[PDB]
């Protein structure tokens, strides 16, 4: 829960007036940094925009960095048909006293690469990991330079950003006629934090399952979510649903 | 690779008519990164809208939230139109004031 | 060694009077008040009163009061509440504690149980309980009454899935309770299971095996 | 009376986890506030005096704020020592008053039980009496529901339920219900159930037997 993260994004063929390339930064579920190609400069992103400094422009020499080799990237593929290349670079909390760090890299939607700490170098098992791995590896400095911040900058900082926001959902249960002999009873949790939350349903007192589950972020920093079962007519006013969120005392029960 | 939009369509705070709150579109899920998204009122484009930055979740599919301030009347209709490399047409997503 | 040491459990009829005792030792009783506090069944606290030994004075709750005495003995280092027109209401857990002017209690005693009814003392009846992978066995501790009673198993050599239920009130005015124990199933055979109840009010033990 | 209105009266929470329970009182009672602990079979135990003081020995974890009315006890990383009841108390004016206490609970995952029927005993046979007994064996959470079936008649009002507290390794609970009917009633019927509705089971475990 206590993470600092950052996404990063490479395309091979930007729509017209897109970036091929743009990062976002996360400390817990909140974003705080944003850049891309275009601009070409790490941006404060909400409450950081309001500041005194030297952080932002190192932050902005990385990433110019990773801009120039993730679309470097590219060209060890040789292929026709687009490529996404996404990385995911940071480090945990862990249960210890520790870093967990995370350096994974997805090409076309699924992962392929990763930077292996103990030896200090990408690597991977499809020939585009070990073509992109090398053509990276050719650059001194930069197993160095991703070796530093995921054992040493990273974990600094997550420490360092030390020195617990709740907010309960607002619930509603309603039901809506469904097919013929049939309705759907959907729970629904309006702007909560933080974002663990859980529903359930029963009936009569017993496990209805879980419904079909849906959630999404509020422009806040809230977030909602929602659940939906389909139950036979007549029948609706034999259910309730249960939400469990760390804005409650106790598991909430929600009625028709 | 290719994955289709999964589009989420709700208020921020339970909807009553004449009360101020927000409208969102949650795209979520998709890929390629590729995607437009509009907010419409009664049939046609709203103008006054902003978005987050487009990130991606640990299974490596994008997503995206648009969103608006606006004020739920009785008649008014609001939808969501996405249009992503994976949709034969771009899908509407009504807003149900139930969900 | 600072404490306060509460006078035994005590059993008394409507109408009737209570005196509980509570001893100071390990501090100079004369240079602190007393408090009293009552806590009857699964329900929360209340102040009855305190008193301050050099002066005399008591400072009393009015929902008492008509029938709560509060008093202290310089020469055994003894405070005392009496407690008049005994009714079933009063039945509780009364504390005393060592209070200042300026502080909350941080010494209390542990308590002395007041029942207030007319049943008599009685000794319990002990039936056995008994009927997969994982069996379970029990006693079921039926018809005393003062309460409480402590039930082991094997002598207390078997405490692993014990479960032992807070005692409930039944409409003959006397307890009951059961006390059960779930086992491997194999075990059945050759090992021997036996609850040992202890019912210290009416003076009587029971070892029950149960099969 | 100053009033102390405590809440919320009970919550479930996890190790390690920031718990948050508030008193108001009905009068300025001025910072003249004490905070208790209390485990069961024990007396109240002080851990903060005047609002804010920690007692000797109280570990930092626990802290206590406010001014005027409003106040709070904040245990800032919960450990398992802590699952108890606490209680707040104004010691400003008299009568002094206590709050209503909150219970602090174990959370832990939702557990189905595992049910037993027990027939009367025939030692017990002979005293005019039946109790015939179902046990509902380490579940979670603590609401359940226990129906009593004669042959098949529901009985409703001849049967009284009894609860543990929290397991010492498992968080769960355990439940007796016992079924009271007089020898002859017993006698004159088949088949005893009883039938277990818990949100942790998908339909009702029915456990029976009949006499014989």
């Known amino acids: 829960h206590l993470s600092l993260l950052y996404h990063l994004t490479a395309v091979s063929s930007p729509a017209p007036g897109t970036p091929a390339f743009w990062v976002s930064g996360w400390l817990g579920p909140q974003q705080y940094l944003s850049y891309n190609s275009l601009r070409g400069e790490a941006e404060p992103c909400g409450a950081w925009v309001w500041e005194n400094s030297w952080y932002w422009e190192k932050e902005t020499t990385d990433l110019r960095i990773k801009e120039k080799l993730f679309l470097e990237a590219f060209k060890a593929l040789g292929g026709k048909g687009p490529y996404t290349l996404q990385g995911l670079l940071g480090c945990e909390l862990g249960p210890d006293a520790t870093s967990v760090p995370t350096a994974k890299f997805a090409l076309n939607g699924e992962e392929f690469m990763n930077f292996d700490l103990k030896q200090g170098t990408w690597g991977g098992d499809w020939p585009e990991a070990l073509a992109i791995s090398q053509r990276w590896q050719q650059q001194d400095k930069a197993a160095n330079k991703e070796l530093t911040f995921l054992l040493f900058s990273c974990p600094h900082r997550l420490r360092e950003h030390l020195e617990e926001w709740k907010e309960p959902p607002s619930m509603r249960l309603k039901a809506r006629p469904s097919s013929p002999g049939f309705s759907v009873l959907t729970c629904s949790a309006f702007s909560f934090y933080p974002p663990e939350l859980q529903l359930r349903f029963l009936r009569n007192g017993l496990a209805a399952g879980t419904g079909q589950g849906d959630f999404g972020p509020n422009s806040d920093g809230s977030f909602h979510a929602s659940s939906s079962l389909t139950v036979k007519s007549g029948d609706e006013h034999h259910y309730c649903c249960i939400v469990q969120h760390a804005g409650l005392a106790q598991p909430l029960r929600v009625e028709l | 690779i290719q994955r289709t939009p999964k589009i989420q369509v709700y208020s921020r705070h339970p909807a009553e008519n004449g009360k101020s709150n927000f409208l969102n579109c949650y795209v979520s899920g998709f890929h390629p990164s590729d995607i437009e998204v509009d907010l419409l009122k009664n049939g046609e484009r709203i103008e006054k809208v902003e978005h987050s930055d487009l990130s991606f979740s640990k299974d490596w599919s994008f997503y995206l939230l648009y969103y608006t301030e606006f004020t739920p009347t009785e008649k008014d209709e609001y939808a969501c139109r996405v249009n992503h490399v994976t949709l034969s047409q771009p899908k509407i997503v009504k807003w149900d004031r139930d969900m | 060694q600072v404490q306060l040491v509460q006078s035994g459990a005590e059993l008394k009829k409507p109408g009737a009077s209570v005196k509980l005792s509570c001893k100071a030792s390990?501090?100079?009783?004369?240079?602190?008040?007393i408090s009293w506090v009552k806590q009857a069944t699964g329900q929360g606290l209340e102040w009855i009163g305190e008193?301050?030994?050099?002066?005399?004075?008591?400072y009393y709750n009015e929902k008492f009061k008509g029938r709560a005495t509060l008093t202290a003995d310089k020469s055994t280092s003894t405070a005392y509440m009496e407690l008049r027109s005994l009714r079933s209401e009063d039945s509780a857990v009364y504390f005393c504690?060592?209070?200042?002017?300026?502080?909350?209690?941080?010494?209390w005693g542990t308590g002395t149980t007041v029942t207030v009814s007319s049943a008599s003392t009685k000794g319990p009846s002990v039936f056995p309980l008994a009927p997969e992978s994982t069996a379970a066995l029990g006693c079921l501790v039926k018809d005393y009454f003062p309460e409480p009673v402590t039930v082991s198993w094997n002598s207390g050599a078997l405490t692993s899935g014990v479960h032992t239920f807070p005692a409930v009130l039944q409409s003959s005015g006397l307890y009951s309770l059961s006390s059960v124990v779930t086992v491997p199933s194999s075990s059945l055979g050759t090992k021997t299971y036996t609850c040992n109840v202890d019912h210290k009010p009416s003076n009587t033990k029971v070892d029950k095996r149960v099969e | 009376d100053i009033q102390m209105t405590q809440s919320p009266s009970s919550l479930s929470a996890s190790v390690g986890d920031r718990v948050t329970i508030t008193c108001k009182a009905s009068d300025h009672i001025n910072n003249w506030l004490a905070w208790y602990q209390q485990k069961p079979g024990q007396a109240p135990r002080l851990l903060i005096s005047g609002a804010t003081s920690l007692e000797t020995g109280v570990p930092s974890r626990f802290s206590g704020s406010g001014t005027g009315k409003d106040y709070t006890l904040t245990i800032s990383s919960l450990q398992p020592e802590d699952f108890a009841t606490y209680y707040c108390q104004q010691y400003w004016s008299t009568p002094y008053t206590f709050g209503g206490g909150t219970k602090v609970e174990i959370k832990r995952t939702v557990a189905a039980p595992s049910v037993f029927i027990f027939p009367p005993s025939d030692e017990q046979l002979k005293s005019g009496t039946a109790s015939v007994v179902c046990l509902l064996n380490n579940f979670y959470p603590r609401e359940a529901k226990v129906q009593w079936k004669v042959d098949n008649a529901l009985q409703s009002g001849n049967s009284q339920e009894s609860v543990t507290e929290q397991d010492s390794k498992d968080s769960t609970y355990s439940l007796s219900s016992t079924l009271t009917l007089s020898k002859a009633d017993y006698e004159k019927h088949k088949v005893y159930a009883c039938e277990v509705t818990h949100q942790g089971l998908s339909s009702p475990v029915t456990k029976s037997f009949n006499r014989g």
């Open positions: 504690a060592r209070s200042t002017t300026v502080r909350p209690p941080g010494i």
């Open positions: 008193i301050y030994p050099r002066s005399g004075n008591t």
């Open positions: 390990g501090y100079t009783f004369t240079s602190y008040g």
